[PDB]
């Protein structure tokens, strides 16, 4: 009974309360925590490991699913148009919305007792976690049906199975293109991008494409970027009243905000024209996720940075210096050494106050404490963990968009044009998208452009 | 395992023909380093009261959050060079790669 008990009995590993806590004044209470499922339940031979419920590939399994029964249930099985099923109750100003999920204890109904709006059904179970994430999912489902609709007018002889797969292969390829060309260089920085992700040659079958255990805690660097509000904007990119600067503690699982508060368009406009939160050694993560994570739908609001650290211990991940060594990076022993590595002896003394030694620093804590790599948003350690993962995901993917046989030379030429701003134009009522690169363009109107200037993806090379 | 194929499987099964489960869903993560547990095989550090890690007491994850992570909401720094879409794409992409189930 992890959600309600403080007793440390398996599968519970609750976070104990420190004295003089800034919020939890009761030391008999705790932050609930369920130990991750063992790969080998109850063994006394195997070193406990955890499961990845998804496909490691960048195959857009957050749209199509990673298991067969779910995949079918996401597809419109009424016609031979090869479409992805849509909400049959509500529509975002005519445009499609993710279908609702039949859940037992639905947390999305808790966020507003009078709205009676449940969670959404997508490729991945976490669709309704934040409306910003739901919007991105709503955008991709629209693209699958935009692609299969356009694909039918092109090749009418093609059946539903031929329509679904081809539209799936396109979406998947778009996810790899935005990720590798636009996303990753801004995460790693020029130097790490060149080191960890040199130019694609061809798929290699000896490259292990699995997600490493540490990647699951390391990629959580993303938590440091989290802004404390959901920013909604009008057709003119001005604050959209009512609720234009809504706190995140009131947006988690708040699916009703998509269905009853102007659709995905003010949300999507906000992600384009609002700056991300920058990571500073004295400004690591906001209190909306550090003190009020899922306040509405739980007995207590959780602490994301602290769950990140408990999860690394649950997963038995080695500490900071072990990973530093793994990457070929120096391993500080002293507070002066850590001070030099972090370029901040105030933080080094603080990290030594808690951990005692740089060996014990939790991977996420150590990772996010490092100075940011030039034109990147991670330090040398996380750049190594993240870069290595993504190389394997590309170099060990038989269906990588650039591998010989996957797409024709012309398809590759057509696919190379795509951009997230164009996809936002192709599927919404947003007339003013962002000038490439979408991840750097954060100010209106300085960084913004009109849809007519954006070239759409031409499916002429798909004509059979 | 099919001899010739044009599309991906839903599960990732058969992407690597030599080791057909690699990258496929509902399988154990790979490990880049051996795991470090209290007992060497399952108990996490911090589980048993008084049990040190590498010769030092184990700091409560919440105390680390309070002492290093905590900051005044007002004193926030906006990224001059990044949009919030950069954040949101990261979480969406994370959701294409991994999900660690709990009971
Ligand atoms: C405000 C939005 C976000 C919320 C509320 C959120 C929430 C969470 C929560 C509650 C967990 C599970 C924590 C646990 O019990 O150990 C989690 C895990 C994770 N998050 Fe975040 N997260 C967000 C954004 C991001 C971003 C932007 C990234 C990366 C760019 C990211 C990467 C991850 C990863 C890898 C995990 C573990 C995934 C797994 O294997 O289950 N998160 N996040
Ligand atoms: C939960 O959702 C309901 C929608 O049913 C919200 O109701 C709207 O609230 C605003 C308040 O300014 C008004 O436009 C209307 O009075 C409401 N419309 C309807 C149809 O009820 C309600 O505010 C939400 N709950 C909370 C506590 O925020
Ligand atoms: O630092 C040396 C070592 O770092 C890592 C990779 O970039 C290797 O190719 C290189 O040999
Ligand atoms: O094992 C993962 C990764 O670890 C490190 C290096 O030895 C790499 O060559 C290797 O790919
Ligand atoms: Ca996937
Ligand atoms: Cl690992």
DSSP secondary structure code for residue B7 in this structure: S
Q: Domain of A161?
A: 1-464
The tokens of A304 are what? 């994301």
A59 to B8: CB separation less than 8 angstroms, yes or no: yes
Sign of CA pseudo-dihedral A282, A286, A289, A290: positive
B35 to A49: CB separation less than 8 angstroms, yes or no: yes
CA-nearest residue, atom 9 of ligand 1: A304
CA triple B81-B83-B84, angle to 5 deg: 140
Diameter over CA atoms, chain B: 60
| Size of chain A, expressed as the number of residues it contains | 464
How far apart CA A242 and CA A65 sit, in angstroms, is 35
Beta carbon of B90 within 6 Å of any ligand 1 atom: yes
DSSP secondary structure code for residue A283 in this structure: B
Separation of A325 CA from ligand 6 center, angstroms?
A: 13
State CA A147 to chain mean position distance: 23
Within 13 A of A459's CA, how many CA atoms are on the CB side? 18
DSSP secondary structure code for residue A456 in this structure: P
Q: What backbone torsions phi and psi does residue A246 show, to the nearest 5 degrees?
A: -80, 130
Q: Chain A: nearest CA to B60, how far in angstroms?
A: 7
State CA A28 to chain mean position distance: 34
How far apart CA A33 and CA A5 sit, in angstroms, is 10
Helix (H) or strand (E) holding A230: strand A229-231
| Closest residue by Cα to residue A144 from A160, A120, A126 | A160
Helix (H) or strand (E) holding B78: strand B78-83
Q: Which residues form the pocket of ligand 4, taking CB atoms under 6 Å from any ligand atom?
A: A 388; B 32
Q: Are the CB atoms for A112 and A297 separated by under 8 Å?
A: no
CA-nearest residue, atom 28 of ligand 2: A112
Q: Domain of B3?
A: 1-103
In this structure, which ligand is nearest to the CA of A250? Answer: 2
How far apart CA B86 and CA B97 sit, in angstroms, is 17
Q: Return the bridge partners of B53, or none.
A: B56
Q: Which of B84, B95, B97, B102 is catalytic?
A: B95
Cβ neighbours around A464 below 10 Å, total = 9
- DSSP notation for A79-128: SSS-PBP--SS--BTTB--PPBP--SS-TTTTT-TTT----B--SSTTTT
Nearest atom within ligand 1 for CA of residue A308: 16
B47 to A13: CB separation less than 8 angstroms, yes or no: yes
Q: Are the CB atoms for A222 and B87 separated by under 8 Å?
A: yes
Q: Are the CB atoms for A151 and A459 separated by under 8 Å?
A: yes
Task: Please choose from A191, A193, A195 the residue to mutate so as to test ligand 3's pocket, defined by most ligand atoms within 8 A of CB.
Answer: A195
What proportions of chain B, in percent to the nearest 5, are helix, strand and coil?
25, 10, 65
Nearest CB to A209; choose among B22, B31, B58: B22
CATH code for position A361:
1.10.640.10
Q: Are the CB atoms for A444 and A430 separated by under 8 Å?
A: no
Domain count, chain B: 1
Does A242 sit behind a cis peptide bond, omega within 30 degrees of 0 on the bond before it? yes
Q: Please tell me which residue of chain B has the smallest CA distance to A9.
A: B47
Q: Chain B: nearest CA to A256, how far in angstroms?
A: 19
B99 flagged as catalytic: no
Cβ neighbours around B3 below 10 Å, total = 5
Domain count, chain A: 1
Q: Give, rounded to a whole angstrom, the gap between the first and last alpha carbons of chain B.
A: 32
How far apart CA A456 and CA A59 sit, in angstroms, is 22
Q: Are the CB atoms for A195 and B91 separated by under 8 Å?
A: no
Cβ neighbours around A123 below 10 Å, total = 27
The tokens of B10 are what? 């839903």
How far apart CA A319 and CA A312 sit, in angstroms, is 9
Q: Are the CB atoms for A96 and A83 separated by under 8 Å?
A: no
Cβ neighbours around A304 below 10 Å, total = 21
SS3 A31: strand
Q: Chain A: nearest CA to B70, how far in angstroms?
A: 7
């Amino acid at each position: 009974n992890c959600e309600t008990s403080c007793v440390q009995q398996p599968p519970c590993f609750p976070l104990k309360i420190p004295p003089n806590d800034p919020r939890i004044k009761n030391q008999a209470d705790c932050i609930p925590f369920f130990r991750s499922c063992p790969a080998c339940p109850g063994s006394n031979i195997t070193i406990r490991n955890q499961i990845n419920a998804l496909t490691s590939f960048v195959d857009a399994s957050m749209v199509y699913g990673s298991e067969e029964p779910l995949a079918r249930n996401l597809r419109n099985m009424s016609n031979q148009l090869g479409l992805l099923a849509v909400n049959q109750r509500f529509q975002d100003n005519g445009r499609a919305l993710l279908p609702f999920d039949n859940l037992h204890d639905d947390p999305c109904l808790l966020t507003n007792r009078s709205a009676r709006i449940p969670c959404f059904l997508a490729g991945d179970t976490r669709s309704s976690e934040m409306p910003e994430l739901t919007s991105m999912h709503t955008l991709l489902l629209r693209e699958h049906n935009r692609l299969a609709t356009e694909l039918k007018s092109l090749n009418p002889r093609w059946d539903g199975e031929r329509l679904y797969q081809e539209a799936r292969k396109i979406v998947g390829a778009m996810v790899q293109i935005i990720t590798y060309r636009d996303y990753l260089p801004l995460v790693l920085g020029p130097t790490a991008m060149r080191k960890y992700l040199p130019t694609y040659r061809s798929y290699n079958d000896s490259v292990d494409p699995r997600i490493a255990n540490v990647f699951t805690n390391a990629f959580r660097y993303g938590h440091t970027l989290i802004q404390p509000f959901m920013f909604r904007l009008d057709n003119r990119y001005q604050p959209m009243e009512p609720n234009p600067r809504v706190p995140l503690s009131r947006v988690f699982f708040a699916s009703w905000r998509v269905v009853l508060e102007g659709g995905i368009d003010p949300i999507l406009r906000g992600l384009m024209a609002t700056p991300a939160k920058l990571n500073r050694q004295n400004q690591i993560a906001v209190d909306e996720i550090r003190e009020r994570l899922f306040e509405q739908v739980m007995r207590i609001g959780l602490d994301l940075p602290a769950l990140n650290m408990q999860r690394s211990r649950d997963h038995g991940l080695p500490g900071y210096n072990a990973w530093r060594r793994f990457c070929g990076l120096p391993q500080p022993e002293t507070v002066g050494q850590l001070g030099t590595v972090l370029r901040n002896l105030k933080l080094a003394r603080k990290l030594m106050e808690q951990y005692g030694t740089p060996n014990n620093i939790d991977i996420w804590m150590g990772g996010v404490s490092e100075p940011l790599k030039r034109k990147g948003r991670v330090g040398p350690l996380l750049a190594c963990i993240i870069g290595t993962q993504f190389r394997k995901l590309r170099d060990g993917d038989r269906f990588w968009w650039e591998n010989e046989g996957v797409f024709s030379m012309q398809q590759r030429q057509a696919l190379a044009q795509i951009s997230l701003p164009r996809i936002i134009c192709d599927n919404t009522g947003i007339t003013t998208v962002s000038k490439n690169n979408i991840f750097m363009s954060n100010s209106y109107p300085r960084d913004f452009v009109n849809c007519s200037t954006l070239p759409a993806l031409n499916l002429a090379s798909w004509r059979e | 395992c099919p001899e010739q194929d044009k599309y991906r499987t839903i599960t990732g099964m058969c992407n690597n023909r030599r080791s057909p489960t690699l990258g496929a869903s509902n399988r154990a993560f790979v490990r880049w380093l051996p795991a470090e547990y209290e007992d060497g095989f399952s108990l996490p550090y911090g589980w048993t009261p008084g049990v040190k890690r590498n010769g030092f007491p184990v700091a409560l994850a919440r105390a680390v959050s309070n002492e290093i992570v905590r900051f005044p909401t007002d004193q926030l720094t906006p990224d001059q060079e990044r949009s919030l879409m950069f954040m949101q794409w990261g979480q969406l992409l994370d959701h294409d790669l991994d999900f660690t189930p709990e009971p």
